[PDB]
Design a protein around this ligand. Structure first.
Ligand SMILES: *[C@@H]1O[C@H](CO)[C@@H](O[C@@H]2O[C@H](CO)[C@@H](O[C@@H]3O[C@H](CO)[C@@H](O)[C@H](O)[C@@H]3O)[C@H](O)[C@H]2NC(C)=O)[C@H](O)[C@H]1NC(C)=O
Ligand SMILES: *[C@@H]1O[C@H](CO)[C@@H](O[C@@H]2O[C@H](CO)[C@@H](O[C@@H]3O[C@H](CO)[C@@H](O)[C@H](O)[C@@H]3O)[C@H](O)[C@H]2NC(C)=O)[C@H](O)[C@H]1NC(C)=O
Ligand SMILES: *[C@@H]1O[C@H](CO)[C@@H](O[C@@H]2O[C@H](CO)[C@@H](O[C@@H]3O[C@H](CO)[C@@H](O)[C@H](O)[C@@H]3O)[C@H](O)[C@H]2NC(C)=O)[C@H](O)[C@H]1NC(C)=O
Ligand SMILES: *[C@@H]1O[C@H](CO)[C@@H](O[C@@H]2O[C@H](CO)[C@@H](O[C@@H]3O[C@H](CO)[C@@H](O)[C@H](O)[C@@H]3O)[C@H](O)[C@H]2NC(C)=O)[C@H](O)[C@H]1NC(C)=O
Ligand SMILES: *[C@@H]1O[C@H](CO)[C@@H](O[C@@H]2O[C@H](CO)[C@@H](O)[C@H](O)[C@H]2NC(C)=O)[C@H](O)[C@H]1NC(C)=O
Ligand SMILES: *[C@@H]1O[C@H](CO)[C@@H](O[C@@H]2O[C@H](CO)[C@@H](O)[C@H](O)[C@H]2NC(C)=O)[C@H](O)[C@H]1NC(C)=O
Ligand SMILES: *[C@@H]1O[C@H](CO)[C@@H](O)[C@H](O)[C@H]1NC(C)=O
Ligand SMILES: *[C@@H]1O[C@H](CO)[C@@H](O)[C@H](O)[C@H]1NC(C)=O
Ligand SMILES: *[C@@H]1O[C@H](CO)[C@@H](O)[C@H](O)[C@H]1NC(C)=O
Ligand SMILES: *[C@@H]1O[C@H](CO)[C@@H](O)[C@H](O)[C@H]1NC(C)=O
Lengths: 48, 50, 49, 192, 50, 148, 49
């Protein structure tokens, strides 16, 4: 991960995390998820 | 009243140029929507529920 | 006009397209939102375009 | 009709989204101007001396001899379009005949956030930046450069060697001034 | 109406008899018989695709 | 029930129309995003103030929920300096013009340098091209041109 | 009166839809104008015509 002295660790995906998203992508997801009405994971089991 | 910006005057002259001696590498973000939520509607239930 | 309830509760009221002096909106009792008074004899009234 | 409003209240919140859509449209209109014009962080001012390599820009730079700081071309455009407008007055003072009838039916017009003077100031700043600095002011701090040098570098950009302008500067300035005068005459003509 | 009736965690006040939701749907009901706070949920539906 | 059905049908039609309007807007935004992706990430764009502000160098895309994020890397000049300049140099009765730079002088000696960075150099016959004489160009300044 | 209210409300809705369509067209035109200003006034464009 040496590119002429540049640093791309903040935008390259990290294999350690199970979801192959970079740090900046994770920050964007966490910022947007404050309001997420698209709950596709819900099904007919939602009877509580 | 709104301030459009800081007043600036350029030292224009017949023989005068400003050649930069340094530089700054600038990284700026840009957010653009691509797609929205895909939705479907059931008339038979919305209009007449049960 | 509000600066946000998280910051302050005082607000400014803008009346759209009416002359302040030509329309003495500060009538005694019988107006919509009658509890509103905003006479503003101390606080200045600014007439904008 | 109070009872009509009472029975309309049973129709649910339908005016809510109509009002929201109209407000969004108005905000979008304001943002359109804010984005197309306010593209400079500084309001550049042209120098008192108006000599730029023999080029004449008197028809497009603003002059202080008018209450509105607009150029001749801007005044011509305003006069051409001023046949139909919002009305230039919204203070109800003169309204006791076309705008008044619409207003009496609850159809008002919101004034733009940016007045014509501020748009003219943006245009003047853009003119000053593109005249005294070329394209440098659009990518950072404005760098002064003689207008002849800027035109020579633009010629180099279009693939013409710099010596062409440095040998035909008088002819090019005359052609540009004639073209500006022709544009002014065409705009001043009855054919809008 | 038609739906699936299930036990509810709603803490109905003694005067309260009918539950409701964001949009005028009686999702909770009180049994006219021996007291039992009950939830009303329409039974499973959805779209069919080929 | 006819009245309620008509009201609800009108509401559904209004919602569908609003969704179509927003779909057109999102289509335009996505087309712009794809164009920016192609012209900034897959290559260098000469369109000023298109891939960020300044002289564009490269762009790195970042995925976002219901959108995309671009990291536009731009070259912004800074720390400028005053410099007296002349459009041409006269050496032996013939005018000289810069190849790809400007003519600058620190008050004593003239130099030629690139337009976007102060890198002064000696005026040399390989750094300039001769065109015409020294009586047709306005502002020409006499100075020696080094022949190596 | 319900018939009249429905008619007036439908007319208002149609006007709002037309306004939204025209606003989208004007927004596209304004985006094009901003792009042209940026690419021609603030710099020199090699794009043909
Ligand atoms: C490229 O940028 C990344 C940015 O994440 C650099 O990695 C991070 O570097 C900082 C500074 O060295 C680390 O902080 C230090 O970590 C040590 C060990 O945990 C701790 O003892 C210090 O007190 C300090 O907090 C940071 O841990 C490290 N990693 C992350 C995920 O932030 C990286 O060094 C840069 N260069 C290269 C070649 O990657
Ligand atoms: C062009 O601009 C760059 C960036 O501004 C200049 O590099 C900067 O140089 C200064 C001084 O040489 C550095 O300051 C340093 O600060 C630390 C703080 O502890 C101090 O310990 C050092 O002794 C030094 O004073 C500064 O960090 C450095 N900036 C970067 C990003 O490396 C460069 O000098 C400029 N060149 C010209 C020709 O103007
Ligand atoms: C740049 O262009 C402008 C406009 O073409 C020039 O101003 C014009 O100057 C001429 C005289 O040189 C004016 O003609 C005379 O004007 C007087 C007063 O209006 C009039 O009574 C005469 O009958 C005659 O028409 C002309 O009006 C004037 N135009 C404007 C719009 O002011 C200006 O001189 C040019 N500058 C350079 C440096 O070339
Ligand atoms: C404008 O730029 C020119 C060129 O860079 C400057 O001329 C330079 O002046 C310095 C003054 O110290 C000269 O350095 C001296 O060089 C001699 C060898 O020739 C050495 O023995 C001395 O110890 C000293 O280092 C340098 O040679 C000279 N270069 C040229 C090409 O003439 C000039 O001073 C600058 N003027 C201003 C106002 O900045
Ligand atoms: C830049 O050069 C121009 C050359 O035309 C100067 O304009 C002339 O300056 C002289 C100086 O006395 C005046 O007498 C003339 O009336 C001006 N105009 C013309 C058409 O000759 C201008 O002054 C110079 N500017 C600077 C800052 O040096
Ligand atoms: C730059 O220098 C040259 C020569 O060093 C000048 O050329 C002069 O041109 C006039 C025009 O007839 C002659 O009468 C002189 O004899 C020439 N000078 C010499 C030394 O022979 C040229 O004029 C100078 N440039 C400027 C702008 O003054
Ligand atoms: C209110 O503003 C403060 C900063 O002045 C901020 O820390 C806080 O989170 C805000 N609260 C809300 C609810 O927005
Ligand atoms: C409001 O009315 C006063 C008195 O009639 C008048 O002087 C003022 O110009 C008016 N303001 C407007 C019309 O904006
Ligand atoms: C009759 O209804 C009452 C309602 O309170 C209940 O308490 C009682 O147990 C019921 N008895 C029978 C036999 O259903
Ligand atoms: C160049 O000099 C002029 C006049 O001395 C001054 O107004 C201007 O700010 C200077 N430019 C720079 C970049 O210092």
């Amino acid at each position: 991960k040496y590119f002429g002295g540049f640093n791309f660790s903040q935008i390259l995906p990290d294999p350690s995390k199970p979801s192959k998203r970079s740090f900046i992508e994770d920050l964007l997801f966490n910022k947007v998820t404050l309001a997420d009405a698209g709950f596709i994971k819900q099904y007919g089991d939602c009877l509580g | 009243t709104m301030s459009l910006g800081a007043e600036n005057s350029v030292a224009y002259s017949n023989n005068s140029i400003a050649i930069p001696t340094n530089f700054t590498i600038s990284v700026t973000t840009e957010i653009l929507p691509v797609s929205m939520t895909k939705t479907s509607v059931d008339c038979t239930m919305y209009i007449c529920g049960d | 006009i509000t600066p946000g309830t998280n910051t302050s509760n005082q607000v400014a009221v803008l009346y759209q397209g009416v002359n302040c002096t030509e329309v003495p909106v500060a009538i005694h009792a019988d107006q919509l939102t009658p509890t509103w008074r905003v006479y503003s004899t101390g606080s200045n009234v600014f007439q904008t375009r | 009709s109070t009872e009509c409003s009472n029975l309309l209240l049973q129709y649910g919140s339908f005016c809510t989204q109509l009002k929201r859509a109209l407000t969004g449209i108005a905000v979008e209109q304001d943002k359109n101007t804010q984005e197309v014009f306010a593209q400079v962080k500084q309001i550049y001012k042209t120098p008192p001396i108006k000599y730029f390599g023999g080029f004449n820009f008197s028809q497009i730079l603003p002059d202080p001899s008018k209450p509105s700081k607009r150029s001749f071309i801007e005044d011509l455009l305003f006069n051409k379009v001023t046949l139909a407008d919002a009305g230039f007055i919204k203070q109800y003072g003169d309204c006791l005949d076309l705008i008044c009838a619409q207003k009496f039916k609850g159809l008002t017009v919101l004034p733009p956030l940016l007045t014509d003077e501020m748009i003219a100031q943006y245009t003047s700043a853009l003119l000053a930046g593109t005249i005294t600095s070329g394209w440098t002011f659009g990518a950072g701090a404005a760098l002064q450069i003689p207008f002849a040098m800027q035109m020579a570098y633009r010629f180099n950009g279009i693939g013409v060697t710099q010596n062409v302008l440095y040998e035909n500067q008088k002819l090019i300035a005359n052609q540009f001034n004639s073209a500006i005068g022709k544009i002014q005459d065409s705009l001043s003509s009855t054919a809008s | 109406g038609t739906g699936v009736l299930t036990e509810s965690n709603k803490k109905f006040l003694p005067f309260q008899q009918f539950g409701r939701d964001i949009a005028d749907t009686t999702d909770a009901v009180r049994d006219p018989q021996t007291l039992e706070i009950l939830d009303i949920t329409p039974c499973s539906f959805g779209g069919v695709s080929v | 029930i006819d009245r309620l059905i008509t009201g609800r049908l009108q509401s559904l039609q209004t919602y569908v129309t609003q969704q179509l309007i927003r779909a057109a807007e999102i289509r335009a935004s996505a087309n712009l995003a794809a164009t920016k992706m192609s012209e900034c990430v897959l290559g260098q764009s000469k369109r000023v103030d298109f891939c960020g502000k300044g002289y564009h160098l490269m762009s790195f895309p970042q995925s976002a929920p219901h959108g995309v994020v671009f990291l536009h890397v731009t070259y912004v000049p800074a720390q400028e300096k005053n410099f007296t300049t002349a459009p041409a140099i006269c050496h032996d009765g013939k005018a000289h013009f810069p190849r790809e730079g400007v003519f600058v002088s620190n008050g004593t000696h003239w130099f030629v340098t690139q337009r976007n960075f102060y890198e002064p150099q000696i005026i040399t016959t390989d750094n300039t091209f001769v065109s015409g004489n020294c009586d047709v160009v306005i502002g020409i300044v006499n100075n020696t041109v080094y022949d190596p």
